[PDB]
Design a protein around this ligand. Structure first.
Ligand SMILES: *C(=O)CCCC[C@@H]1SC[C@@H]2NC(=O)N[C@@H]21
Lengths: 588, 510, 96
C-alpha cells in the first residue's frame, strides 16, 4: 500500500476518506481553499496545503494546484472523492505524468462513460438492457460494482435513489424495496457486465431506470466512474469499507473477496443534511455553525464535514452531512433515521432536517410507493411547524436567566422588576419564524410565570449554568433540555426534537408615520444662485439624482434627491436663493 | 477621488522613506564603521518588541536649509519602553553631526511640550555637535531657543516626570546640560564625551592640547567627576540600562474617563479616499468621514437639525470616548453657539475633543455682523481655549483665518495636531486672497486679472502646502488619511495619562 | 493575543511611514538568526536572516497546548511548551 495519500476533496467526504487512511495507517494530506482554512478536514488530516482562493475554479478544480500539492508533500496516491476531479481525465493524466497513482478507474473508462452516446454503445455490445429511447413512473435504481486489475468484478448490491428534488438526491436506500432476490441477481450480473465492458477497476456505480409497474424490466441509464455519496448504505449492509477496498485495488492488490462473501444483513437508509431552507424554497443558506450535536444512537452513523466554528458559504455544494440508519427492516431503519434526525442539531445554519423529517413521515415514503416525481409532488404541501409559545418562552427564559446569573445578586442589576407596588414583568419582544410577540416573565428562575402575547400563561423554571452549552426549561412541568447558542442578536435553540432561532426585536413606535414621512424637501445650504436644474419639474426620480445645483462662494452645491419620488422644482436657473429656501419638494 | 488621494499618499510615503535614511550614505557608513548603531536603530532598539512608534514631525525642515537637514537632524516621538509610553528624542548624528538647526531646537522643545502635557517620561539619546553657528541668533538666546530645553528638563523634573539621558556621542557647550540636567545619565565608554568647553576652545584659551576622550570621556565622568550615573559598554548596553531605568518609574495614571472594549469600524479606512475630495472647492458631507472612523459607526449627533454646517456628537474611537467637532460648510453664528454648548458638555463629562478642520471661515455680510456672528464666534473660541479636557486636531481640508482659531488650531494647544496631505493652512485661502486683491484692483481685463492673480495663488499655495507646514512644526505631521483612526487611537491612550484641571471659563460674551 | 487589542500593546510595529517588522533573534541547534515578521497573525510574512521570505499564518489559542502555522500554504500543527527562556515545539515529525 501507499505510504502517503492526498485527499483532493473537502467536507464530509474528505473527513470520510481521512478516517479510513488513518485506520489503514497511511499519512493523510488534505487540501483546502482559503474559504476552508478552518474546515474540519484540514484539522483531521496530518498535513494540509492551501491550494488557492475560495472559488472552486481556483481551488479544488485547479488541476495544477492539486498536483502541485501532491508533488510538494510526496503523496504517492490521490483519492479524489467525488464531485470534483474524480471524473476528470486531464487530472488523472497529470497525476500519471507526475508519477502519482490516481485512485480510480482508467482515463479511457472515464472518457467513455462521460457521454451517454458512447456509454450506450459500449454497454449494449455486452448485452446489458438499454432504454430504447421515456418511462412511466420511473424508479432510479443503481448497482455498486467493485473491480480490480486482475479481472475480478463484484456487485455489492443495489440502491434506490428515487427521492429527488429537482434531480437533487435527498434520501436514499439499500436495498431497493422494489426488487426481489431473483431480479436483483440479474441486475447485479448486468452491472458486472457494464463494468467488464470498459475494463473497469475500482469502485463504480451503474444507474438503471425501472418502471414501477415492471420491477424485472431494467434499462441502463449511466455509469458513474467513482464512489457515490450514497456509498455508506451499501457499506453498512455489506460491511465492506469501500474506501479501503478502493485503495487496495489502486495499490494493485486483488479484491480478496468473492460473490460468496457478499451479504446483505439488513436495510439501510440515509438522508442528506443540506444548508438549504425549504420554507424559503430550498434556497441555499449559510453562516457560522455556532454549535453542533450529531446523533450517536445504535445503528446510527454520521458522516460530516461540520465542526463548531466552521463557516458555511455559497462557494460549494450545500451538502453538510449525511445521517445513515441501518436496521433489520425498512420500517426499523426509517424509525432509526427519524430518531437520529430528531437528535441532529445544527445551530447557526438553517437546514432541511425538518423537511427530511416531514418526508420520512409521508405515507408514500413509509409504504414505499416511491417514484422520481414523488418528492417534487409532495414538497408543495410541506409547511414548517408553527411557532408555539414554548419556542418564545424558552428563549425569553434563557435571556432572563442569563441576565439574572450575570447580576451576581447585585440588587440593582438583578432583573427582578421589583416595585413598592405590583412588580413589573421582565418583558421581551421576540421574533421567531412568522411570529413576533411579547413574553412577560414574573418571579425568579427557580419559580416563575411566563405569559405570551396572543398566548397562554405557563409555569416556568429555568436552569441556566454559566458557560454551559445546555440550558433546561421546565415548562408547565415538562422539562426540556436545549442546546443553546447566542450571538449579538440571535438565540439558537435545539431541543424537544426541533431547532429554531429567535430574534430580540425593537418595540414598534407608538405613533405610526403619516405618509409625509415618505416626502422630503431640499433647501439651499447657502445664499447664492441656481446654476443648473438636473430634473424636469414634476418627474419621477431616484434617491441618486442631482435635482438642483446652487453656486455660492464659488462652490457648486449639487443637491441630491434623498428619496425616490415625484420631484417638483421650485426655481429656475439664474434665480437668487437664500439659506433654507426650498428649491424642490420630492414626494412619495 | 481615490486616485488623487493615492497619488498624494504615495508622495507622502516617498518623502517619509527619504527622510528616514538620515544623512548621506558616506556618513551612515562612517557612523556604523565606528561601531555605533544608527540613530533610528537606537530608537527602534529602545522600544519594547513590536511597539508602535508615533513619530513627531518626521518631515521637519523639509525644503529648508537646502534639504541638507533631513528630519531636522532629529528623531522624536512616542514609543512604549518597559511598558510605558515615553517621549524619545534622539540626535541624528549622521545629519551634520547632529548640529542643532533652529528647527532642531523647535522639534526638541515640541517633544518636551508633549512630555510635559501628557506626563510622559523623557529619554534623550544625545549625540550632537552643537549649534549651527551661521544661524546662532535663531538657535540662541530667545525664550524658545536652545536654553529653554534645560528649563524644560528642570521643571518637568520638579513635577516628577523622569528625565533620562544616554550620551552616545558628542555632547558639547550648552548641550552638556542635557546629561547634567537629567535625573539619571548613561554614557557609553570610549564614545560619549561631555564638556562645557571642547578641545578647540581649550586650545584657543590655554594652549593645551587634549583629545575629547581625555577631556570629558565616559571613564572620566563615570569614575571621577560624577556627571554620569551609568557606564555602558556599547549602544545596546546603554539602551538596556535605559530600559531598566524606565522600569523603576512605576505605572502611568489610569484615564480620567471610562475606556470600553474597542469595536472595529464598519468600513475599510481607505474608503476615506472615496468620500473626501482633494479639491477643497467640492462640498461633501463630513458624516461620511465620521461614520467611517468611529467604533461600530456609532455616532450620537448633538443638535443635528441646528447649525448644520457644524457637526458635533459623541462616539468612541478604540474604546475611548470622543466628542467629535467637524466642519461641514461655512461657520454661522448658530454653528458657533452649537460648538460652544457641545464643548461645555464634553468638559463636564470629561470627554476628550476631536476637531476635524475643513473651514473657510465665517459667513460674511451686513446681516451676519448685525446678528453678532463675531460674538458667537468669540463664545466658541472661549470654550475651545478654556476647555480642560484633552483636545486633538486633524486638518482634513482647509484651515483658514478665524476658522482656524475657532476649530482649535495650533495656538490653542491641541494636545496633538496633524494634517492630511490634501490640507491647506493660511490666513486666507489662495482664491480668497486673489479675489479680494483683484476686487481692490477694480476692473481689469481677464488676461490682466489672471496675470495679477497668479503670484498671489503661487504664494498661498507654496506657504499653505502641508509640507511647508510640517517643515516648520506648525503641525506634528502629515499623515495618511487611512491612518487617522490609528493615530487618534494612539493619541487617546497618551492624553489620558495626565489628570484634569477643574472646569474654568473666561467671560462668555453672551 | 495577550495585547487584547490595546493599540500600544499590540506588536504591530506601526509607523507613520514604513512599519517596523517584529524582530526575534532565535537560536536553535547550531543556527542563530533573526526572524522578521510583518503583517498580522491572520496574514503575515516572515523573512529569516541567511534565509528566504515566506508567507505565514499563525493560529494561536490562549492556554492551548497546540498551535498551528501555515507556512507558504503548508499547515502544520505543533505541540508547544514554553519556559522563561526556551520554546519547545513538536510537529511535522520533528521535535526541537
Ligand atoms: C472667492 O474667492 C471669495 C471666497 C471667500 C469668501 C467666503 S464667505 C464665506 C467664507 N467665510 C470667509 O471668510 N471666506 C469664505
Amino acid at each position: 500500500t501507499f505510504d502517503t495519500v492526498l485527499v483532493a476533496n473537502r467536507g464530509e467526504i474528505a473527513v470520510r476518506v481521512i478516517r479510513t487512511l488513518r485506520a489503514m495507517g497511511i499519512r493523510s494530506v488534505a487540501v483546502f481553499s482559503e474559504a476552508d482554512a478552518g474546515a474540519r478536514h484540514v484539522t483531521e488530516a496530518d498535513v494540509a496545503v492551501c491550494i488557492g482562493p475560495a472559488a472552486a475554479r481556483h481551488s479544488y478544480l485547479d488541476i495544477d494546484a492539486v498536483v502541485g500539492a501532491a508533488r510538494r508533500t510526496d503523496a504517492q496516491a490521490v483519492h479524489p472523492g467525488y464531485g470534483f476531479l474524480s471524473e476528470n481525465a486531464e487530472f488523472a493524466s497529470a497525476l500519471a505524468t507526475a508519477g502519482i497513482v490516481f485512485i480510480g478507474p482508467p482515463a479511457s473508462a472515464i472518457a467513455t462513460m462521460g457521454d451517454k452516446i458512447a456509454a450506450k454503445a459500449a454497454v449494449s455490445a455486452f448485452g446489458v438492457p438499454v432504454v430504447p429511447g421515456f418511462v412511466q413512473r420511473p424508479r432510479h435504481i443503481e448497482v455498486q460494482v467493485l473491480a480490480d486489475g486482475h479481472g475480478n468484478v463484484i456487485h455489492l448490491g443495489e440502491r434506490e435513489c428515487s427521492l429527488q428534488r429537482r434531480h437533487q438526491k435527498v434520501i436514499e436506500e439499500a436495498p431497493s424495496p422494489l426488487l426481489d432476490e431473483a431480479t436483483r441477481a440479474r441486475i447485479g450480473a448486468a452491472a458486472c457486465a457494464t463494468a467488464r465492458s470498459v475494463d473497469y477497476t475500482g469502485a463504480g456505480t451503474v444507474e438503471f431506470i425501472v418502471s414501477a409497474d415492471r420491477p424485472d424490466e431494467f434499462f441502463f441509464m449511466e455509469m458513474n466512474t467513482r464512489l457515490q455519496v450514497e456509498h455508506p448504505v451499501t457499506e453498512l449492509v455489506t460491511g465492506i469499507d469501500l474506501v479501503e477496498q478502493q485503495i487496495r485495488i489502486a495499490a494493485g492488490e486483488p479484491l480478496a473477496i468473492g460473490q460468496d462473501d457478499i451479504t446483505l444483513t439488513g436495510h439501510a437508509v440515509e438522508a442528506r443534511v443540506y444548508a438549504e431552507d425549504p420554507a424559503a424554497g430550498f434556497l441555499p443558506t449559510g453562516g457560522d455553525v455556532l454549535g453542533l450535536r450529531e446523533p450517536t444512537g445504535r445503528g446510527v452513523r454520521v458522516d460530516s464535514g461540520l465542526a463548531a466554528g466552521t463557516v458555511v458559504g455559497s462557494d460549494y455544494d450545500p451538502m453538510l452531512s449525511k445521517i445513515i440508519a441501518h436496521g433489520s427492516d425498512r420500517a426499523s431503519a426509517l424509525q432509526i433515521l427519524d430518531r437520529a434526525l430528531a437528535d441532529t442539531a445544527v445551530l447557526g445554519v438553517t437546514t432541511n432536517i425538518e423537511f427530511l423529517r416531514f418526508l420520512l413521515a409521508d405515507d408514500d415514503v413509509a409504504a414505499g410507493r416511491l417514484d422520481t416525481g414523488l418528492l417534487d409532488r409532495r414538497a408543495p404541501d410541506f409547511a414548517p411547524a408553527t411557532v408555539g409559545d414554548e419556542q418564545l418562552i424558552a428563549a425569553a427564559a434563557y435571556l432572563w436567566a442569563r441576565q439574572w446569573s450575570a447580576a451576581g445578586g447585585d440588587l440593582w442589576r438583578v432583573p427582578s422588576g421589583w416595585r413598592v407596588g405590583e412588580w413589573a414583568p421582565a418583558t421581551f419582544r421576540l421574533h421567531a419564524g412568522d411570529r413576533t410577540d411579547h413574553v412577560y416573565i414574573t418571579g425568579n428562575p427557580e419559580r416563575a410565570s411566563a405569559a405570551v402575547e396572543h398566548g397562554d400563561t405557563h409555569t416556568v423554571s429555568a436552569d441556566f449554568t454559566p458557560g454551559s452549552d445546555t440550558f433546561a426549561v421546565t415548562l408547565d412541568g415538562l422539562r426540556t433540555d436545549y442546546r443553546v447558542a447566542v450571538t449579538d442578536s440571535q438565540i439558537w435553540l435545539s431541543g424537544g426534537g426541533r431547532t429554531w432561532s429567535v430574534q430580540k426585536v425593537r418595540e414598534e413606535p407608538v405613533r405610526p408615520d403619516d405618509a409625509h414621512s415618505g416626502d422630503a424637501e431640499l433647501v439651499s445650504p447657502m445664499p447664492g444662485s441656481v446654476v443648473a436644474v438636473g430634473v424636469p419639474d414634476g418627474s419621477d426620480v431616484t434617491a441618486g439624482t442631482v435635482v438642483v445645483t446652487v453656486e455660492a462662494m464659488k462652490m457648486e452645491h449639487a443637491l441630491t434627491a434623498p428619496v425616490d419620488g415625484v420631484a417638483k422644482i421650485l426655481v429656475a436657473v439664474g434665480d437668487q436663493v437664500k439659506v433654507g429656501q426650498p428649491l424642490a419638494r420630492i414626494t412619495a | 477621488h481615490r486616485d488623487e488621494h493615492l497619488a498624494l499618499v504615495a508622495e507622502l510615503r516617498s518623502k517619509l522613506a527619504a527622510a528616514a535614511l538620515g544623512g548621506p550614505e558616506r556618513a551612515r557608513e562612517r557612523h556604523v564603521g565606528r561601531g555605533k548603531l544608527l540613530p533610528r536603530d537606537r530608537v527602534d532598539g529602545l522600544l519594547d518588541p513590536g511597539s508602535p512608534f508615533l513619530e513627531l514631525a518626521p518631515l521637519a525642515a523639509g525644503g529648508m536649509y537646502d534639504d541638507e537637514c533631513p528630519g531636522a537632524g532629529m528623531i522624536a516621538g512616542i514609543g512604549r519602553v518597559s511598558g510605558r509610553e515615553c517621549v524619545i528624542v534622539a540626535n541624528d548624528a549622521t545629519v551634520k553631526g547632529g548640529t542643532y538647526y533652529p528647527i532642531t531646537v523647535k522639534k526638541h522643545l515640541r517633544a518636551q511640550e508633549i512630555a510635559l502635557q501628557n506626563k510622559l517620561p523623557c529619554i534623550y539619546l544625545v549625540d550632537s555637535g552643537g549649534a549651527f553657528l551661521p544661524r546662532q541668533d535663531e538657535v540662541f538666546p530667545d525664550r524658545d531657543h536652545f536654553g529653554r530645553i534645560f528649563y524644560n528638563q528642570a521643571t518637568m523634573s520638579a513635577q516628577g516626570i523622569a528625565q533620562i539621558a544616554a550620551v552616545l556621542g558628542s555632547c558639547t557647550a550648552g548641550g552638556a546640560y542635557v546629561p547634567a540636567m537629567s535625573d539619571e545619565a548613561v554614557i557609553v565608554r570610549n564614545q560619549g564625551t561631555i564638556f562645557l568647553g571642547g578641545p578647540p576652545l581649550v586650545k584657543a584659551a590655554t594652549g593645551e592640547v587634549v583629545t575629547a576622550e581625555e577631556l570629558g570621556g565616559g571613564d572620566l565622568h563615570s569614575k571621577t567627576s560624577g556627571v554620569t550615573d551609568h557606564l555602558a559598554h556599547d549602544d545596546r548596553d546603554a539602551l538596556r540600562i535605559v530600559r531598566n531605568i524606565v522600569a523603576t518609574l512605576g505605572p502611568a495614571e489610569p484615564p480620567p474617563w471610562q475606556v470600553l472594549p474597542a469595536v472595529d469600524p464598519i468600513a475599510d479606512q481607505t474608503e476615506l479616499y472615496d468620500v473626501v475630495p482633494v479639491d477643497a472647492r467640492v462640498p461633501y458631507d463630513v458624516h461620511e468621514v465620521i461614520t467611517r472612523i468611529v467604533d461600530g459607526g456609532e455616532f450620537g449627533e448633538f443638535k443635528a437639525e441646528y447649525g448644520t454646517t457644524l457637526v458635533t456628537g459623541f462616539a468612541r474611537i478604540h474604546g475611548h470616548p470622543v466628542g467629535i467637532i467637524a466642519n461641514n460648510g461655512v461657520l454661522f453664528g448658530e454653528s458657533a453657539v452649537k460648538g460652544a454648548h457641545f464643548i461645555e458638555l464634553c468638559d463636564k463629562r470629561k470627554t476628550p475633543l476631536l476637531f476635524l478642520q475643513n473651514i473657510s471661515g465665517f459667513m460674511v455680510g451686513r446681516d451676519y455682523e448685525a446678528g453678532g456672528i463675531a460674538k458667537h464666534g468669540a463664545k466658541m473660541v472661549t470654550a475651545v481655549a478654556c476647555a480642560r479636557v484633552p483636545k486633538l486636531t486633524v486638518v482634513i481640508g482647509g484651515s483658514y483665518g478665524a476658522g482656524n482659531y475657532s476649530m482649535c488650531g495650533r495656538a490653542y494647544s491641541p494636545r496633538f495636531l496633524w494634517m492630511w496631505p490634501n490640507a491647506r493652512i493660511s490666513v486666507m485661502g489662495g482664491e480668497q486672497a486673489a479675489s479680494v486683491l483683484a476686487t481692490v484692483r477694480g476692473e481689469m481685463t481677464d488676461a490682466e486679472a489672471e496675470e495679477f492673480k497668479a503670484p498671489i495663488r503661487e504664494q498661498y499655495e507654496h506657504q499653505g502646502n502641508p509640507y511647508y507646514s510640517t517643515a516648520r512644526l506648525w503641525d506634528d505631521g502629515v499623515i495618511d488619511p487611512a491612518d487617522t483612526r490609528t493615530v487618534v487611537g494612539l493619541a487617546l491612550s497618551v492624553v489620558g495619562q495626565a489628570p484634569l484641571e477643574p472646569v474654568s471659563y473666561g467671560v462668555f460674551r453672551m
